[PDB]
Design a protein around this ligand. Sequence first.
Ligand code: NAG
Lengths: 48, 49
Amino acid sequence: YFKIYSKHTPINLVRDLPQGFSALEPLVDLPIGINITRFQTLLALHRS
Amino acid sequence: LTGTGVLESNKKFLPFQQFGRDIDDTTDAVRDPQTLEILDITPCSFGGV
Ligand SMILES: *[C@@H]1O[C@H](CO)[C@@H](O)[C@H](O)[C@H]1NC(C)=O
């Protein structure tokens, strides 16, 4: 089971992580049943 | 989940949350399927005679 927990926070700090506490609500539980050892972040390019 | 008790509540459950637990860890509220409402479970009256 792949458990994904999520939390969305409005912040106004410029560079680093704000210091505080926010509990992450569970977002989804996926019955994927696969071996995971590596992960990748997906970004979006901007073209002009 | 089986049990005995009397089934309205004012507890603001979060959407993921289904049931509720007291200090004793006994279930105090549950979310019913089909209708999604939150029912407070209070143990039936008992005591010494
Ligand atoms: C059946 O249950 C689902 C969730 O458990 C609920 O969304 C749906 O409204 C229910 N349908 C009826 C007819 O009770």
